[PDB]
């Protein structure tokens, strides 16, 4: 059992979803038609990969996933693409008209017309689960659907499935690939309305991914395809513990216990290594020590910020491939004597470690070298609040003039929702400050 339902909302959520499911198929030996010849239990089972895939009597392995967008063109590519047979048509849901980069349209005007249908489809997936663990929700901060429809959905999910866990993968905006001036508004509105409905949220800063693609993959001008293939490897690392067995595997829930000291402080920093091209990986094997030490290089983080100028509340290392504890412990010992790792005085300083033995996979035509071992660090650091500070400042600059606010007011929103959202973010920045102060 232990089923997890993935929900992909808007363009960013959908396209990241495509990259993740493609990768999961390759990792588990599932073909594009859904067949998995290695699975000898036809039509069911309680294998570790069944947390993410259900099975039909005809041997098809079907993602436990709903894709939702308010216009049809991105989801139409899934319907006509390589993995079209993977998904039942009812899992792929589209409207006719998008949210036009406006939270208010995604949450209210357009989103309201489709929310009951989406919950209906999610319910069909939930009814097939014998021990549903919870939801994984993929979306942008900046789009109208990724912001506004996601908030509406998260609120409705708390109503319909109570405290059942909900995790996010949230794409934080960057100017090199952003498509709207109002993204800071949409990011603050959704963060505010979703904060009480999410147990844990993994922010992915497009600018950090964009820079990693340029600096480490030698990609001159990264596209969404480049960014998403890398994002999917990080997602896969995080979810690998739910999808594979092994004696040193540590479930995501157990990392969560350590990552979330108070409900609002639920935003881990992910750092992934190694991100290396094929031309550089050839005849240069990276060891456990090298990949682990790369987790403390800010340039490998998924969110731009500087952990050397905040405090740690937890550090978790999620390894995959050819990795034994002895080498992990020796790498950690070395790092502690050399680096700026300062914990708050109320948390213990031990790193929590999981190892899944199944090695990393790459997608054909990809940019990443295939490697024997990789690691994703999940740290709870006060430094992640910097990402909130940058976004809050941009919000203030515009909001002091009410720039663009009439677009939201014209869809039925009030100014009071803006300032309520902004004050919740001010209090969040303040929470992150208070947790790093010493105990008296």
């Amino acid at each position: 059992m232990r089923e997890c339902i993935s929900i992909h909302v808007g363009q960013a959520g959908v396209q990241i979803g495509n990259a993740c499911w493609e990768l999961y198929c390759l990792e588990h030996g599932i073909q594009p038609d859904g067949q998995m010849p290695s699975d000898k239990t036809i039509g069911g089972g309680d294998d570790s990969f069944n947390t993410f895939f259900s099975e039909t009597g005809a041997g098809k392995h079907v993602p436990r996933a709903v894709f939702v967008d308010l216009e049809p063109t991105v989801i139409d590519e899934v319907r006509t693409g390589t993995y079209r047979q993977l998904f039942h048509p009812e899992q792929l849901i589209t409207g006719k008209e998008d949210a036009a980069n406006n939270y208010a349209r995604g949450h209210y005007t357009i989103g309201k017309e489709i929310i009951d249908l989406v919950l209906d489809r999610i319910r069909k997936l939930a009814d097939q689960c014998t021990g549903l663990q919870g939801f994984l929700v993929f979306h942008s901060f900046g789009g109208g659907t990724g912001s506004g429809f996601t908030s509406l959905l998260m609120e409705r999910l708390s109503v319909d499935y109570g405290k059942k866990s909900k995790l996010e993968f949230s794409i934080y905006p960057a100017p090199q690939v952003s498509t709207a001036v109002v993204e800071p508004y949409n990011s603050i509105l959704t963060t505010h309305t979703t904060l009480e409905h999410s147990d844990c949220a993994f922010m992915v800063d497009n600018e950090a991914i964009y820079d990693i693609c340029r600096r480490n993959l030698d990609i001159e001008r990264p596209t969404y395809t480049n960014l998403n293939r890398l994002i999917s490897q990080i997602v896969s690392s995080i979810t690998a513990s739910l999808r594979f067995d092994g004696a040193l595997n540590v479930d995501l829930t157990e990392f969560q216990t350590n990552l979330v000291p108070y409900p609002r402080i639920h935003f881990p920093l992910a750092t992934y290594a190694p991100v290396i091209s094929a031309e550089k990986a050839y005849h240069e094997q990276l060891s456990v020590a090298e990949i682990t030490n790369a987790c403390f290089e800010p340039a490998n983080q998924m969110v731009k910020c500087d952990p050397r100028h905040g405090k740690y509340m937890a550090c978790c290392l999620l390894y995959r491939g050819d990795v034994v504890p002895k080498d992990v412990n020796a790498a950690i010992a070395t790092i502690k004597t050399k680096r700026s790792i300062q914990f708050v005085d109320w948390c213990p300083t031990g790193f929590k470690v999981g190892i899944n033995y199944q090695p990393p996979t790459v997608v054909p035509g990809g940019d990443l070298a295939k490697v024997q071992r990789a690691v994703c660090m999940l740290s709870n650091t006060t430094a992640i609040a910097e990402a909130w500070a940058r976004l809050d400042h941009k919000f203030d600059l515009m909001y002091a003039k009410r720039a663009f606010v009439h677009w939201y007011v014209g869809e039925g929103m009030e100014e009071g929702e803006f300032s309520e959202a902004r004050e919740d973010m001010a209090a969040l920045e303040k929470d992150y400050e208070e947790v790093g102060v010493d105990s008296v």
Binding site: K96, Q176, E220, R221, K394, M398, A400, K401, H406, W407
Partner: protein
């Protein structure tokens, strides 16, 4: 998805027809409405502007309106004249004689209902109408008076749809018709309240470009319209081809219009070529289609569209370079206010081009120039009997002027505003 196109009056129909010629060529649609192109990118968003009829014929979603019949004959005989739906031609007999009140209150009111019947029939069969684009001039009577009436009536029936205009602003350098500044002021009063987005295509600027830059000693309507059609192709590229940025009229409005009244854009085009050169030229005063110096104001928002095969790295770097070296001209309180799209398909006869759409507080210079010409006549009540004879009061002129002066002050307010 679908856009409904309306062209009104002589100017509107002439620039309208050229728009359809230029985009039908870019999409591989010939004058019979048959597709004979080489690339699936041409057909992927074809339904934005064209209906499909029987026999894989593509028919512009286009309505052709005038109070003067005969503009209908000249369009119908033009190179692409057979492509338009015959029932979408709606023409009166009278003319409007360069009188806005005839277009808006008397002659145009008589004809407006039959135009709406055609609008509704086109709209009814749209899968998901996004809105409307109107091509017209502001200096005559039909495009100006009747065009702004149509806008108001359309808005009543489709209040949640986007209304976009390509509005040709008058200049003494191109028409000597003396009442043009009245007709333009009265129109601007309408546009300020009832459009979401207006491309100010200024006959002053088109003339100055043909004369100074292109070295044409006596520019014709054909030479002015060559600039208008390249601009219109450019500013609708994002609507017509697959792409990320400003892909529909509402998303463009949301990116470009920070306050609802300040929705008058300065278009530009280059060339009139390396990526650094396109980029410098597209931001040059001499390449703007509104006679305004952008260095006399500040940019609220900008869309830059590059077309052709070029390095996206170089485009990003140059866009960043212009913003950095010209930072004082972009308002600091709208972060990241310049957006860039690159489309692989160049326009006809160029390897590379750039189209510029600016929401600049310098547009106030256009309105002030019209305002000056308006007042010079209005202070002596000159030529007013043409308008009072159709039932209008002086008070309506006073209000229109005052509202356009308010628009000017508002553009000035945001220019002077500071972050701190």
């Amino acid at each position: 998805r679908e856009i409904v196109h309306i062209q009104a009056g002589q100017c509107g129909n002439q620039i309208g027809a050229k728009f359809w010629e230029v985009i039908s060529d870019e999409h591989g649609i010939d004058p019979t409405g048959s597709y004979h192109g080489d690339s699936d990118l041409q057909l992927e968003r074809i339904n934005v502007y064209y209906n499909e009829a029987a026999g894989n014929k593509y028919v512009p979603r286009a309505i052709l309106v005038d109070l003067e019949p005969g503009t209908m004959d000249s369009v119908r005989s033009g190179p692409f004249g057979q492509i338009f739906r015959p029932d979408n031609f709606v023409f009166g007999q009278s003319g409007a004689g360069n009188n806005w009140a005839k277009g808006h209150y008397t002659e145009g009111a008589e004809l407006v209902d039959s135009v709406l019947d055609v609008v509704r029939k086109e709209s009814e069969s749209c899968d998901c109408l996004q809105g409307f684009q109107l091509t017209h001039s502001l200096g005559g009577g039909t495009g100006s008076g009747m065009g702004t009436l149509l806008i108001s009536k359309i808005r009543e029936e489709y209040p949640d749809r986007i209304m976009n205009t390509f509005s040709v602003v008058p200049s003494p350098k191109v028409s000597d018709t003396v009442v043009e500044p009245y007709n333009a002021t009265l129109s601007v009063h309408q546009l300020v309240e009832n459009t979401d987005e207006t491309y100010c295509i200024d006959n002053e600027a088109l003339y100055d470009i043909c004369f100074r830059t292109l070295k044409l000693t006596t520019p014709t309507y054909g030479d002015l319209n060559h600039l208008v059609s390249a601009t219109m192709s450019g500013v609708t590229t994002c609507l017509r081809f697959p792409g990320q940025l400003n892909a529909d009229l509402r998303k463009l409005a949301v990116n470009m219009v920070p306050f609802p009244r300040l929705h008058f854009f300065m278009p530009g085009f280059a060339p009139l070529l390396t990526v650094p050169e396109l980029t410098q030229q597209m931001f040059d005063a001499k390449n703007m289609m509104a006679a305004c110096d952008p260095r006399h104001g500040r940019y609220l928002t900008v869309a830059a569209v590059f077309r052709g095969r070029m390095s996206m790295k170089e485009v990003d770097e140059q866009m960043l370079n212009v913003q950095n070296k010209n930072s004082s001209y972009f308002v600091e309180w709208i972060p990241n206010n310049v957006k860039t799209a690159v489309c692989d398909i160049p326009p006809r006869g160029l390897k590379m081009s750039a189209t510029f759409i600016g929401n600049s507080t310098a547009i106030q210079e256009l309105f002030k120039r019209i305002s000056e010409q308006f007042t010079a006549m209005f202070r002596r009540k000159a030529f007013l009997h043409w308008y009072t004879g159709e039932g209008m009061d002086e008070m309506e002129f006073t209000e229109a002027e005052s509202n356009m002066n308010d628009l000017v002050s508002e553009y000035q307010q945001y220019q002077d505003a500071t972050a701190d």
